[PDB]
Structure 1
């Protein structure tokens, strides 16, 4: 049904650094995270999905 991204350690680490630079999981936006990460192939849909999961995880 849904295509999922391969969140490697390196990619997840880049994501967490982006989230933190934007003030944390509650303050960061998918678009802001996407803009900071500058990863070829990454999309809003996938960042949003991961950010929602990250918030769920804590």
Structure 2
């Protein structure tokens, strides 16, 4: 059946621990490299997708204003 990139995973709930992991990666990344693919790799979460990160990073950037 589906697998890897095509797996139809449930909605990602950003727990406080997951979010803190995200922030610690983004905060210490070169601003040039603070993009969803790089964030996704550095966060080291089996099953996290680049799209999960992009949507979360969008709101985060509004929060940082």
- What TM-score, normalized to structure 2? 0.73
Larger RCO: Structure 1 or Structure 2 (Cα < 8 Å, ≥ 6 residues apart)?
1
Q: How many residues align?
A: 55
Tell which structure's C-alpha radius of gyration is larger.
Answer: 2
Structure 1 segments, 4+ long, off by >2 Å, are none
Q: Considering fraction of residues, name the structure with more helix.
A: 2
User: What residue ranges of structure 2 are gaps of 5+ in the alignment?
Assistant: 1-9
2:48 is aligned, of 42, 45, 51, to 42
User: What residue ranges of structure 1 are gaps of 5+ in the alignment?
Assistant: none
- What TM-score, normalized to structure 1? 0.81
